[PDB]
Amino acid sequence: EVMLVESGGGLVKPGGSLKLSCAASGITFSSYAMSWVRQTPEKRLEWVASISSGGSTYYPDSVKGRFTISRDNARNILYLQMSSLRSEDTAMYYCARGPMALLYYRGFDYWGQGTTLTVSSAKTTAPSVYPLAPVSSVTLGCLVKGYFPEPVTLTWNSGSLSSGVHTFPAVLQSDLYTLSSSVTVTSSTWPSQSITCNVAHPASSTKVDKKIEPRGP
């Protein structure tokens, strides 16, 4: 599989610097035009930087002066150095095989999974993970509260139960995110089989498991 993987996202205060990386697998960056494209929390896609095969970089006026795009040929990594980060830079940053004049490469045809950047003054906080049990089908849940910033991954039995899941987008109030997830199953599985909520917030260095057990009197 041909694949791009971003990294280096996280929390920065307004005015701070941060350097995003992009590793490749199956593509050598030097051969193609490469770009960075960002997506705001309101889902507005904005192009932020690109570098041609020859080495010529070019940027939009909204991001020029502060952002600089570079590339290490030997290690085969594409970078995006950012500095004096403003509040509008809060976004999901994507690495992508950028636009070229030749027919086949005129769009952004490969895209990485995306590393997220938050630009705010709020301090990092670890989540609290609560197992939500009930009072043919049976529904369980998991509450992740009081964490900052995003992202936080939530999975069920380490990605075993993917079907019948509903993980809800996080919502902010007073610089603290709240996230929740639910899992519907048959009456046979649970309480007999063991369903557990696996949460992980990498910005505050915490990975946690919570086994949902039936509550007593």
Contact residues: other proteins, CB under 8 A: 2, 26-28, 30-33, 35, 37, 39, 43-47, 50, 53-54, 58, 60-62, 94, 98-109, 111-114, 128, 130-135, 137, 139, 141, 143, 145, 166-171, 173, 178-180, 182, 184, 215, 217
Which residue lies nearer to other proteins by CB, 18 or 98? 98
Residue holding tokens 């649970």? 190
**Strands 18-25 and 3-7, sheet pairing:** antiparallel
CA 43 vs CA 72, 92, 114, 115, 145: distances in Å: 30, 9, 14, 15, 24
Q: Write down the least CB distance from residue 45 to other proteins, Å.
A: 4
- Six-digit token pair at 133? 């049990």
Whether the CA torsion 165, 3, 44, 107 is positive or negative: it is negative
Which residue lies nearer to other proteins by CB, 15 or 45? 45
Q: Write down the least CB distance from residue 18 to other proteins, Å.
A: 20
Which residue lies nearer to other proteins by CB, 42 or 121? 42
Count Cβ atoms within 10 A of the Cβ of residue 49 and give its class: 0-12 exposed, 13-18 middle, 19 or more buried. Answer: buried
Q: Write down the least CB distance from residue 100 to other proteins, Å.
A: 5
Q: Write down the least CB distance from residue 157 to other proteins, Å.
A: 19
Which residue lies nearer to other proteins by CB, 84 or 113? 113
Identify the bridge partners of residue 4 per DSSP, sorted by sequence position.
24
